[PDB]
Design a binder for this molecule. Structure first.
Ligand SMILES: O=C(O)Cc1cccc([N+](=O)[O-])c1
Ligand SMILES: [Zn+2]
Length: 257
């Protein structure tokens, strides 16, 4: 099955998932000089005051912080979006070293990591139906750089020891994702895809310009996770990022001057 190795990594995904070579794949390089300011874009509305996290999961590809999405509790609206999108999970992508890890790039710059907050359009009723629609998901992407620690991340880092290997989960209630957001909500937006199989072309991407800072210690704890299951040969969970894909016939729009 798919993964991030030599034999099963991004460059192989197209054989099981031919949409890998589609017209609206993610991530992409954001060329800041060609992304045009669009005065018609709105401020993003991120309303996470009632978010109810429940659990953290090592799925063998990353870890997922999961939310109760059975009511309108943590929603993304505005920005480029029409309608209301409910938070279902967040996860990250990161590198073996601080010089790579992000999926999106900015003028070819790779960040140490990238956070993805995944939301589904309530007009489709559930996540599985939403992913079948071109406007089914909105993913908020946030870059991570290594410097100062992010106090709001530390709760996540400290639970990772309990989900070292694939298929482990742990109760993870009361975690507030507002602690992961940067000061500015300036963003770039474009139409794209999931970045893991099945690579469905169902996402409005909203990538924040301002990175968050995390400490080397924090990211080092991400790199102690394992792709393998309990008691199998250890292969560290690192470099779980898809590289930039062809932009094709897309425009990247900026919310800011
Ligand atoms: O389980 C999976 O890898 C598919 C999946 C599910 C939810 C979000 C995703 N994304 O690319 O942001 C991908
Ligand atoms: Zn992701």
């Amino acid at each position: 099955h798919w993964g991030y190795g030599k034999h099963n990594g991004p460059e192989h995904w197209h054989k099981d998932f031919p949409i890998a070579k589609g017209e609206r794949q993610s991530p992409v390089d954001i060329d800041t000089h060609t992304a045009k300011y669009d005065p018609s874009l709105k401020p993003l509305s991120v309303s996470y005051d009632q978010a109810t996290s429940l659990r953290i999961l090592n799925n063998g590809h990353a870890f997922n912080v999961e939310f109760d999405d059975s009511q309108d509790k943590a929603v993304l609206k505005g920005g480029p979006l029409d309608g209301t999108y409910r938070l279902i999970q967040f996860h990250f992508h990161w590198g073996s070293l601080d010089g790579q890890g992000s999926e999106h790039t900015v003028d070819k710059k790779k960040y140490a990591a990238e956070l993805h907050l995944v939301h589904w359009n309530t007009k489709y009723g559930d996540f599985g139906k939403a992913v079948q629609q071109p406007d089914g998901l909105a993913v908020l992407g946030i870059f991570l750089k290594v410097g100062s620690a992010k106090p709001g991340l530390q709760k996540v880092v400290d639970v990772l020891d309990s989900i070292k290997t694939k298929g482990k989960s742990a109760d993870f209630t009361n975690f507030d994702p507002r602690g992961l957001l940067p000061e500015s909500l300036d963003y770039w937006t474009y139409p794209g895809s999931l970045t893991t199989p099945p690579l469905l072309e169902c996402v409005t991407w909203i990538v924040l310009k301002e990175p968050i800072s995390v400490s080397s210690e924090q990211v080092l704890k991400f790199r102690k996770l394992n792709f393998n299951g309990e008691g199998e040969p250890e292969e560290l969970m690192v470099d779980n990022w898809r590289p930039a894909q062809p932009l094709k016939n897309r425009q990247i729009k900026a919310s800011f001057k």
